[PDB]
Amino acid sequence: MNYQMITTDDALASLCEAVRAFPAIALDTEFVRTRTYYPQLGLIQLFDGEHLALIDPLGITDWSPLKAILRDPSITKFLHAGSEDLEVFLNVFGELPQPLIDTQILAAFCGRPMSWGFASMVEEYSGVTLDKSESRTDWLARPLTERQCEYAAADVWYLLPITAKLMVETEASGWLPAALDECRLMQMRRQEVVAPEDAWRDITNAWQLRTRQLACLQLLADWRLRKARERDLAVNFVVREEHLWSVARYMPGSLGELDSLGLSGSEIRFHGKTLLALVEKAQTLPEDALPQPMLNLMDMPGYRKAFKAIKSLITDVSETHKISAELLASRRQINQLLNWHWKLKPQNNLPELISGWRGELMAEALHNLLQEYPQ
Ligand SMILES: [Zn+2]
Ligand SMILES: [Zn+2]
Ligand SMILES: [Zn+2]
Ligand SMILES: [Zn+2]
Ligand SMILES: [Zn+2]
Structure with missing residues (x-):
């Protein structure tokens, strides 16, 4: 299993020039889960059966050649358990690949668990037991170790043969149309963007609030999501969800009250004044501008x-x-x-x-x- 590291625009362009002639490619990504709003992408892997590439996003400036491959209808893109991959793709490319098929979804229609793991699937089809020693490593560290690269490469190397096998199995069962529609559904859901004004709708206990309190939550969640996107920090690292709800429920009027409600010193020194102003804004809002319970x-x-x-x-x-x-x-x-x-x-x-x-x-x-x- 030989892989090529791609860290320059020219190398990426050259790779895509060769890949464009193929009918399908196996894809995968590696990223770390930190405190950022957008996941930190550390690698993108691609395999067309002949070219196995590990693409380092840190060295790429022009993604155009790859985005062309990813939207090419003559090239079927495959991945396994790609919910998070879709998220990363949208963040770096601004669009999802198409057509894109998830082998975990194909397998589910064939009778496998919707959560069937990649390693388990590879074991079943190739008889190969994958090494997970590098699964939970720092994908942003550089240079990546040979072992890390091999782990990342294996995720697409073994996937390609399996895509052909599962496409046949799924078609043979009469479930291919449904499986492809299901893949499309997951893709459509991931493409949905939450507008700041609707952020409150996703707070699961917002229903417990009365109108004035809800108006507050709407303003608070709107502000928080915008701040999260501005600072590139997960929303809870801006103001903890429980704390934000408390501000909406109790409608505090002073910094001392924010302390009483449990907000941290950092949340208060950085956002205290803003939070209190949002509460006051909701307090003075005209009823014809209030949200429905x-x-x-x-x-x-x-x-x-x-x-x-x-x-x-x-x-x-x-x-x-x-x-x-x-x-x-x-x-x-x-x-x-x-x-x-x-x-x-x-x-x-x-x-x-x-x-x-x-x-x-x-x-x-x-x-x-x-x-x-x-x-
Ligand atoms: Zn070229
Ligand atoms: Zn090449
Ligand atoms: Zn993945
Ligand atoms: Zn992987
Ligand atoms: Zn502000």
Whole structure:
């Protein structure tokens, strides 16, 4: 297994010139989890069957050649368990590769766990036991060690042959259309960008607040997300989630009160004045500018009965179509459908359970079931 380190624009351009003739490439990335808002990318790996490249983002300035490869419809891009990879791709390229297929998703439609690990999959198809000794290392350290490079290279080297095997297995089972739609769905979700004004909607206990308190949370979460993106710090390193909620709930009027609420010395010295000003702003906001209270799905009449009924339906669909119930519907997706049914919150698209491949399988049954619960 021979790999090439690519750290210059010219080398990247040369690589892509050769790769463009191939029908598919295996991709992967390595990044570290720190306190930054955007993950710190340490490496991108690519393999077309002949060229195995380890691309060092620190040495690249012009990504154009690779972005061209990544959007080329004649080159199928493959990865395994790529949720985080999608995040990194959007941050460095501004767009996701297409067409892009995830072997973990293909395997799930073939009967494997939605969380089937790369090493396990490689063991199954190649009989090779991967070395995980370099999995949790510092991908930003330089130069990377030979062992690190080998680990990174193996993630695409062994993936390519498996992509061909799984594409055949998935097609042979009749689930390829569904698997590709599912891959598209994950990609669409990752592309969604949260506007600062909507940051509050993702705080899971925001529903417990009254109108004035919620107006405060909206302003606070908007400010925090913008600050996080400005400083490149995860939102909780700006102001802890619990602390931000407390400011919204208790509507403090002094720095002394922020201390009483538990905010740290750093949060107070850097953001105290701002937080208090946001509270005051919400306090003086005109009622016609206040947000509507949230409707806790769990407190809607019939919720528990409907949830149980849907779970039961999913089980029947699962046994009939010989597909995992977890793949058919997660708790998140069931709640998404019920939030839609009862119009408990704004949703951009139709619920996943009654759209795309899932809808084709059970939308009729789900709509029939929902007739038992008043909108
Ligand atoms: Zn060239
Ligand atoms: Zn080359
Ligand atoms: Zn990955
Ligand atoms: Zn990897
Ligand atoms: Zn500011």
